[PDB]
C-alpha cells in the first residue's frame, strides 16, 4: 500500500552537563534504519537495517556531515529559542523536529510533513500546500516571518517532491523482502483465573509488522469495546511488535467470547476463541 | 543590527561590471534581500535569500555572500539598471542598507550659470525672488553661494536639484533667494558664485540693481 519515510531530530539543552545533545533517527514505515547521537565516542550517522548497509561511503559521509552541522545549528537554535521566550540559559529545554514524505502504490508524492516543536509543544509546521507556515505562538511568528521572507518553503517543497521520494523508493526496492512484505501476527488465547468466579481471557498477538493492528473481544457477535483492557503496542526488540487484550468474565462464559484480530498482513480478519 | 552598503553612490558606463557590497554587524546566515528603486516605479525585488534570482529578472544579476558580507553583481550594466539599491536583513529585525545610487558615467561638463532678477509683478506683490540656474554639468557635486553687496548671504535661500538627464547624462540645479520688497530695495549687486570640480575658481555671475 502507501508507504512513508520520516526523520526525527531531538535537541536537549543541559546547562552544566556539557553542550546540548543532538539525536537523529530515520524511519521508513515502522522500521528504524539510521541513527545519530552527538554524545558518542565518534559522532556519526550509522545504519540500523540490513538494506541500508548496501550503500556507499559517499552516502554515509553526506549523512554524517549533515548531522555534524545539524548539531551546532540546533545548539544555536536553542539559544535563539531562549532569546525568543526570554528564558534562562540555566534551564533545560528540548527542540524536536519531524519531517518526511508518503508515497502511494505508484511511487509519487502524496503528502509531505515538516513540523518543529519547542518544549513538547507545537512550534511551527509546514502546511500540506508546501508553501505556507503555521505558527502556534507569537515567538514562532518571528521564525515564520523570516522563513517566508526568504521563501524557504520553496527549498522544502523541492526536497520533498524530489530527493525524498527518490531515495524512499530506492529504500523500498532495496528491501522489498522486509519493508514491502506483510507478516501476520501470531495469536492465541490465554485464560488466567483471578478468583473462583472470575477469569481473565487474553488475546495475544506476537511478531507482526507494521504496528497498525486492532484487537477486539466480541460476545456472540456484539462488539463490547467497553470492558476490554488494552495495552499500547510495544516493540518486541527484533523490529516486530506485540499486543494483547484482556476481558474479565465469569466462569463458564468462556465460549461466548471470541477474539477478532485485524492486521494489514492478514488477508481476512482472524476470528479466534480458545 | 546595522547593515552598511557601499558605495553610497557611483558612476558607471554601459557594459561595465558593477558590484554593490552590504556588510552586516553579525552573522545573518542567508537572510538578505536586494531591492531596486527606479524613480516612481514600484520597488523590484531582484535577489532574495542572499543568492537566488527572482524568476524573470535578467541573468546579468547575481547575488553572493555569507555570514556578514554579501554582494550583488551586474555583469554587464545596462541603462535600465540605474536606480537606488537596498539590502535588507531579516535574521534579527528588519533593517535596510543606506542605499546605493547607480548612475551614468560621461565626460565632465561645466555648468551654465544664469541669474535672473525679480519680475515686476512680484515687486508689486511685495516679494522679490532672485533666481540662479546652474545648467547641464557633471559630476553631481556642485556648491553655490549667494552674495549681497559683497557679503555672503545664506538666509531665505531655496535649493532644488535635478536628477540625471536621460538625454545627455548631466545635472541641473536651481537656487532661489527670496526677500521682501524693501529688503531687496535696500541693497545692490546680487552675485551667484558657483563651485564645481571642473574649475578651481568660482564661476561668478552677478547683476546690479540699476
Amino acid at each position: 500500500g502507501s508507504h512513508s519515510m520520516r526523520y526525527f531530530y531531538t535537541a536537549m539543552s543541559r546547562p552544566g552537563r556539557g553542550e546540548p545533545r543532538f539525536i537523529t533517527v530515520g524511519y521508513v514505515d515502522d522500521t528504524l534504519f539510521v541513527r545519530f547521537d552527538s554524545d558518542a565516542t565518534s559522532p556519526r550517522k550509522e545504519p540500523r537495517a540490513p538494506w541500508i548497509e548496501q550503500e556507499g561511503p559517499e552516502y554515509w559521509d553526506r549523512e554524517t556531515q549533515i548531522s555534524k552541522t545539524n548539531t551546532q545549528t540546533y545548539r544555536e537554535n536553542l539559544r535563539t529559542a531562549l532569546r525568543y521566550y526570554n528564558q534562562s540559559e540555566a534551564g533545560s529545554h528540548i527542540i524536536q523536529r519531524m519531517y518526511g514524505c508518503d508515497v502511494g502504490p505508484d511511487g509519487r508524492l502524496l503528502r509531505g510533513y515538516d513540523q518543529y516543536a519547542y518544549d513538547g509543544k507545537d512550534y511551527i509546521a509546514l502546511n500540506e500546500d508546501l508553501s505556507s507556515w503555521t505558527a502556534a505562538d507569537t515567538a514562532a511568528q518571528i521564525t515564520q516571518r523570516k522563513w517566508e521572507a526568504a521563501r524557504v518553503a520553496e527549498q522544502d517543497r523541492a526536497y520533498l517532491e524530489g530527493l525524498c521520494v527518490e531515495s524512499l523508493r530506492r529504500y523500498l526496492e532495496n528491501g522489498k523482502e522486509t519493508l514491502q512484505r506483510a507478516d501476520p501476527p501470531k495469536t492465541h488465547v490465554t485464560h488466567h483465573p483471578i478468583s473462583d468466579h472470575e477469569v481473565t481471557l487474553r488475546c495475544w498477538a506476537l511478531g507482526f509488522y507494521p504496528a497498525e493492528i486492532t484487537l477486539t473481544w466480541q460476545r456472540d457477535g456484539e462488539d463490547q469495546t467497553q470492558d476490554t483492557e488494552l495495552v499500547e503496542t510495544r516493540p518486541a526488540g527484533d523490529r516486530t511488535f506485540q499486543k494483547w487484550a484482556a476481558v474479565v468474565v465469569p466462569s463458564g462464559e468462556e465460549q461466548r467470547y471470541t477474539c477478532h484480530v485485524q492486521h494489514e498482513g492478514l488477508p481476512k480478519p482472524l476470528t479466534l476463541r480458545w | 543590527t546595522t547593515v552598511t552598503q557601499t558605495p553610497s553612490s557611483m558612476y558607471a558606463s554601459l557594459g561595465e561590471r558593477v558590484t554593490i557590497t552590504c556588510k552586516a554587524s553579525q552573522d545573518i546566515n542567508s537572510y538578505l534581500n536586494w531591492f531596486q528603486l527606479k524613480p516612481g516605479k514600484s520597488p523590484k525585488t531582484l535577489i532574495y535569500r542572499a543568492n537566488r534570482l527572482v524568476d524573470g529578472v535578467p541573468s546579468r544579476f547575481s547575488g553572493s555572500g555569507s555570514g556578514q558580507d554579501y554582494s550583488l553583481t551586474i555583469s554587464s550594466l545596462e541603462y535600465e539598471d540605474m536606480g537606488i539599491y537596498y539590502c535588507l536583513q531579516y535574521d534579527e529585525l528588519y533593517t535596510f542598507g543606506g542605499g546605493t545610487k547607480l548612475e551614468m558615467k560621461r565626460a565632465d561638463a561645466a555648468p551654465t550659470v544664469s541669474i535672473f532678477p525679480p519680475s515686476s509683478e512680484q515687486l508689486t506683490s511685495g516679494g522679490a525672488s532672485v533666481v540662479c540656474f546652474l545648467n547641464n554639468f557633471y559630476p553631481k557635486d556642485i556648491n553655490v553661494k549667494w552674495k549681497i553687496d559683497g557679503s555672503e548671504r545664506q538666509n531665505g535661500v531655496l535649493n532644488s536639484w535635478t536628477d540625471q538627464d536621460s538625454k545627455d547624462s548631466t545635472y541641473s540645479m536651481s537656487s532661489t533667494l527670496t526677500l521682501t520688497k524693501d529688503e531687496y530695495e535696500r541693497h545692490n549687486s546680487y552675485t551667484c558664485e558657483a563651485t564645481h570640480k571642473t574649475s578651481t575658481s568660482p564661476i561668478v555671475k552677478s547683476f546690479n540693481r540699476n
Binding site: 526523520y7 552516502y59 553526506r62 549533515i66 545539524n70 535563539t80 524557504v152 522544502d156 531515495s167 | -
Partner: peptide, 9 residues
C-alpha cells in the same frame, strides 16, 4: 535521503 539544508529558527 536527508535534506542537507537546515534553516535557523
Amino acid at each position: 535521503e536527508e535534506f542537507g539544508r537546515a534553516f535557523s529558527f
